[PDB]
């Protein structure tokens, strides 16, 4: 499914992402916007044979297991296919682990290039949260 902007912001807030590890809600909504355009079914092949999955484009080399990626680590200990549900629970849980890897949200390429250093609050603006 393709989440509405405010709909996703509300869902992420109930999942405890607002100010999680110091990152205000806007950061997470912005990351999802540029990583998957709020599409829970989005997937993109990478170059090391890995594939990125879901609304937060979680990688199959370090975070989830898709059974075909070289050097798999599965640090989130979860099948990548489980990160494609219309329910964001799995993606959020894994995202909380990724952001604690030692690089903060810099782990997300789209966040670095389109959200970091910007007015991310604009992404939750107008939402009745």
């Amino acid at each position, epitope marked *: 499914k393709v989440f509405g902007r405010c709909e996703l912001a509300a869902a992420m807030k109930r999942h405890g992402l607002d100010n999680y590890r110091g990152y205000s809600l806007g950061n997470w909504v912005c990351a999802a916007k540029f990583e998957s355009n709020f599409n829970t*079914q*989005a*997937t*993109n*092949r*990478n*170059t*090391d*044979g890995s*594939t990125d*999955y879901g609304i937060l484009q979680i990688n199959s080399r370090w975070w989830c297991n*898709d*059974g*075909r990626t*070289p050097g798999s680590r599965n640090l989130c200990n979860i*099948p990548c*296919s489980a990160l*494609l549900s219309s329910d964001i629970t799995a993606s959020v849980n894994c995202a909380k682990k990724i952001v604690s890897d030692g690089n903060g949200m810099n782990a997300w390429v789209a966040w670095r290039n389109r959200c970091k250093g910007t007015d991310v609050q604009a992404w939750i603006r107008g939402c009745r949260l």
Partner: antibody, heavy 116, light 107 residues
């Protein structure tokens, strides 16, 4: 024993669309990607794209975006590839296949001829 | 981006017992290389994955190696049934296959 059974040969006229099936068996259909490849004499092999049944997710090679569309029916464990706006250049053999640490068999291939 | 894979020799012949080596050169560096074997009239079969791992049923006389922009497939001792066309493939964002090396029997 995993198997991928494709539909038979196709003969289509230019401008039409065709849908090729790939019936899977021997494993959990929704847990594995099914890729597709095109083969033409002299041109070799070309990767088209892939689909992960059940999630509805798909990845396409940039050269096939807009030409191929993958769908799947979990009630029968069958994946499909639809090719639109057919031209003579689309004639060839098409394969569905697996590529992972558990198995990597290819379907028997489907021959497509596009001509008036 | 289109990564071009050039295989050589394009066509070669070998007698049983002979060592065979074929190369696959990439226009850009790739992390891993894959190889597939195809015999006339039948579907390709994955032969080597993740650069040096043998697919199921592949005999130990086959080996894969390489890195960066140069990879290879080697048969320690050619057997009659090894005659076929071998295609290399980079399995990245937009997978591409080499033009193949046609291995024929020398007589």
């Amino acid at each position: 024993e995993v198997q991928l059974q494709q539909s038979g040969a196709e003969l289509m006229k230019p401008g039409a669309s065709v849908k090729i099936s790939c019936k899977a068996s021997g494993y959990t259909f929704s847990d594995y990607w099914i890729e597709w490849v095109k083969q033409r004499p002299g041109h070799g092999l070309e990767w088209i794209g892939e689909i992960l049944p059940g999630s509805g997710s798909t990845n396409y090679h940039e050269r096939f975006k807009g030409k191929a569309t993958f769908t799947a029916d979990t009630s029968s464990s069958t994946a499909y590839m639809q090719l639109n706006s057919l031209t003579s250049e689309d004639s060839g053999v098409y394969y569905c296949l697996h590529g992972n640490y558990d198995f990597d068999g290819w379907g028997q291939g489907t021959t497509l001829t596009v001509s008036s | 981006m289109d990564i071009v894979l050039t295989q050589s020799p394009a066509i070669m012949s070998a007698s049983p017992g002979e060592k065979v080596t074929m190369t696959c050169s990439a226009s850009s560096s790739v992390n891993y290389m894959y190889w597939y074997q195809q015999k006339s009239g039948t579907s390709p079969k994955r032969w080597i994955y993740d650069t040096s791992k043998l697919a199921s049923g592949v005999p130990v006389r086959f080996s894969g190696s390489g890195s960066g922009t140069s990879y290879s497939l080697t048969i320690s001792s050619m057997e009659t049934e090894d005659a076929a066309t071998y295609y290399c493939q980079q399995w990245g964002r937009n997978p591409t296959f080499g033009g193949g090396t046609k291995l024929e029997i020398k007589r």
